[PDB]
Amino acid sequence: GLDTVSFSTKGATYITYVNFLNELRVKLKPEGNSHGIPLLRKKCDDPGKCFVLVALSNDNGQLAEIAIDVTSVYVVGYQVRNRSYFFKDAPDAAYEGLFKNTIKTRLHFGGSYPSLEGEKAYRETTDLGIEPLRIGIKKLDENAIDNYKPTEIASSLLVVIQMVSEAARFTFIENQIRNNFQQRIRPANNTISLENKWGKLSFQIRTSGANGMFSEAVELERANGKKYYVTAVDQVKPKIALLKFVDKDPK
Numbered sequence: 197g198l199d200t201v202s203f204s205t206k207g208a209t210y211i212t213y214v215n216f217l218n219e220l221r222v223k224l225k226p227e228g229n230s231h232g233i234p235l236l237r238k239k240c241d242d243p244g245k246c247f248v249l250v251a252l253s254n255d256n257g258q259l260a261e262i263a264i265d266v267t268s269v270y271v272v273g274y275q276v277r278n279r280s281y282f283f284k285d286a287p288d289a290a291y292e293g294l295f296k297n298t299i300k301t302r303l304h305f306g307g308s309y310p311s312l313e314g315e316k317a318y319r320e321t322t323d324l325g326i327e328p329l330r331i332g333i334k335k336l337d338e339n340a341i342d343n344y345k346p347t348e349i350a351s352s353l354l355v356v357i358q359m360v361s362e363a364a365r366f367t368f369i370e371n372q373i374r375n376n377f378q379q380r381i382r383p384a385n386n387t388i389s390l391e392n393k394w395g396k397l398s399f400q401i402r403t404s405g406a407n408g409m410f411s412e413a414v415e416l417e418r419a420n421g422k423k424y425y426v427t428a429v430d431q432v433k434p435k436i437a438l439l440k441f442v443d444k445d446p447k
């Protein structure tokens with residue numbers, strides 16, 4: 197009994213994409229906020245109501261249903277046709293609890309960015325945009341077989357992970373995509389450092405006082421790699437849509 201959200205690439209526009217992201221942001225059901233920024237639930241372990249299904253379909257009707265964790269917006273697995281695939285690191289509760297009545301498989305690689313790079317999918321060389329998304333859905337469906345190609349699944353999920361999860365977390369990434377929607381673009385050093393620092397930013401923001409000062413600054417990068425440090429909430433607030441609930445200092 198999960199919540200579901202749909203997005204079709206057929207006749208898709210930058211507007212249908214943004215409306216989709218905001219529908220997802222709502223269904224993740226964050227609880228409360230920190231400094232005005234929505235704060236994702238700290239705990240939600242029951243697979244029966246701790247995942248949101250994102251139904252992605254392309255112009256040809258091919259469909260891929262992605263399972264996303266409501267506490268982290270983490271993609272743990274997906275279903276295509278009558279089959280389901282899960283990242284090697286997907287917890288047992290989810291593997292057993294999600295996508296029942298499907299032929300289940302556990303991928304031989306994790307869902308983290310470095311695990312995906314092990315399957316040749318690198319953020320720096322993977323195109324993002326509506327066409328890259330149509331192709332990703334197409335590939336996931338084409339690989340709804342026993343002898344699937346892990347490199348195709350990895351690159352396709354890398355596109356999905358950033359266009360859905362990262363964009364849902366960061367308004368900055370959402371707009372990099374929105375204003376490049378009908379084009380193919382690769383994330384730069386700015387987009388990549390944000391993606392990498394979501395946890396640290398989330399912890400420093402939540403634990404800061406009314407003045408918003410971070411106890412420890414967070415290093416980010418400009419498009420060209422030049423580093424800069426975020427030392428206050430307001431310095432990054434306009435770039436974030438959702439905050440992760442982080443307990444201990446992450447690192």
Ligand SMILES: *[C@@H]1O[C@H](CO)[C@@H](O)[C@H](O)[C@H]1NC(C)=O
Nearest residue numbers: 319320383384385419420421
């Ligand atoms: C980071 O900036 C360098 C130039 O300073 C550039 O060559 C590189 O492609 C950038 N990283 C990415 C993947 O955007």
Ligand SMILES: Nc1ncnc2[nH]cnc12
Nearest residue numbers: 269270271307308309361
């Ligand atoms: N599988 C995944 N889901 C969501 N965000 C991610 N960032 C890196 N890997 C991810």
